Design a protein around this ligand. Structure first.
Ligand SMILES: CC(C)(c1ccc(OC[C@@H](O)CO)cc1)c1ccc(OC[C@H](O)C(C)(C)C)cc1
Lengths: 12, 242
C-alpha cells in the first residue's frame, strides 16, 4: 500500500 | 545454566541507546505542537494529534535501530510499524505515567494529561478504562529500562501482525529478542520482582492487542467526520488510516 511518509522515515 | 551472551548484551546496549536517542525526558519539543485546550467538543484533538504524530516518528526511529529489523522487506517494515505504532506509543508513555493522579506527566501542567484530556481527543472509557488499567499494571511491574526497551522491540517485531509476508523471518528476529529478555530476567532481575516477570510482560502485549483494537474502532469513528480528520496530521492519517 502507499505509505510515502512512513517509507521515507524508514529509509537508510 | 542461563548466561547473558556477548551478543545478548550487545542487543541490550543498542536498544537502550536507540531508546535514548528517541525519547526526550525533557519534553522540550512539546512547544512545537498546536496548543492544548482545556476549560468541549474535541478541544484536545489538535494537541494530542500533534503529540501522537511526533510519537509515531520516534517509534519509527526506534524500530529502525532494532537488531534485525533492517533485514525485513520494506513491505514488512511498514506492516509491523502500522500495526504496532499505537501499542508502542501506549508502552513508551508509561515512562511519564503517574499512579499518584493517574495521568501522563510530561514536565509541566500544560503537558500533564489525564482521562478527561484523552476523552477531549475523542475517546470514551471503552478505551480509556482498559488503558489506565494497563498503565497501572505496567508501572507495578517496575521494569528495568533494559526490560522496557526489550518489550517495545518485541512488540514491534511480531510475526502474527495482519499482512506480514515473511513471518518466519519476523519470528526469528523476535525470538532472538525474546530469548534476550528471558535471560536478562534470570540473570539481572532479582526475586521477588522477577517472579513470573516474563509471562506478565507477554500478558501486557496481549492487553495491548485489545487496546489497539479498541483504539482503532474509536479512531475510525473519530476520523469518520472529515471535519475531525482535517485536524489530524498527514503522518497520523497515513499510519492510522484515512
Ligand atoms: C494518553 C496517550 C497514551 C499518550 C500518548 C502519547 C504520549 O506522549 C508522550 C509519552 O510517550 C511520554 O512518556 C502521552 C500520552 C494517548 C493515546 C492515544 C491518543 O490518541 C488520540 C487520537 O486517537 C488521535 C486521533 C489524536 C491519534 C492520545 C494520547
Amino acid at each position: 500500500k502507499n505509505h510515502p511518509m512512513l517509507m521515507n522515515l524508514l529509509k537508510d | 545454566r542461563p548466561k547473558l551472551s556477548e551478543e545478548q548484551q550487545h542487543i541490550i546496549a543498542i536498544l537502550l541507546d536507540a531508546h535514548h536517542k528517541t525519547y526526550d525526558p525533557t519534553y522540550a519539543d512539546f512547544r512545537d505542537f498546536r496548543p492544548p485546550v482545556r476549560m468541549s467538543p474535541l478541544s484536545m484533538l489538535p494537541h494530542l494529534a500533534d503529540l501522537v504524530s511526533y510519537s509515531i516518528q520516534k517509534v519509527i526511529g526506534f524500530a529502525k535501530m532494532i537488531p534485525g529489523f533492517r533485514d525485513l522487506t520494506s513491505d514488512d517494515q511498514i506492516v509491523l510499524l502500522k500495526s504496532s505504532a499505537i501499542e508502542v506509543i501506549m508502552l513508551r508513555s508509561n515512562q511519564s505515567f503517574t499512579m499518584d493522579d493517574m495521568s501522563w506527566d510530561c514536565g509541566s501542567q500544560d503537558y500533564k494529561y489525564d482521562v478527561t484530556d484523552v476523552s477531549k481527543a475523542g475517546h470514551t472509557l471503552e478505551l480509556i478504562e482498559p488503558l489506565i488499567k494497563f498503565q497501572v499494571g505496567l508501572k507495578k511491574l517496575n521494569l528495568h529500562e533494559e526490560e522496557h526497551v526489550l518489550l517495545m522491540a518485541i512488540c514491534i517485531v511480531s510475526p502474527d501482525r495482519p499482512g506480514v509476508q515473511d513471518a518466519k523471518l519476523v519470528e526469528a528476529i523476535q525470538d532472538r529478542l525474546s530469548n534476550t529478555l528471558q535471560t536478562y530476567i534470570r540473570c539481572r532481575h532479582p526475586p521477588p520482582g522477577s517472579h513470573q516477570l516474563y509471562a506478565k510482560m507477554i500478558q501486557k502485549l496481549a492487553d495491548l492487542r485489545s487496546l489497539n483494537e479498541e483504539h482503532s474502532k474509536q479512531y475510525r469513528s473519530l476520523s469518520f467526520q472529515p471535519e475531525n480528520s482535517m485536524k489530524l496530521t498527514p503522518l497520523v492519517l497515513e499510519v492510522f488510516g484515512n
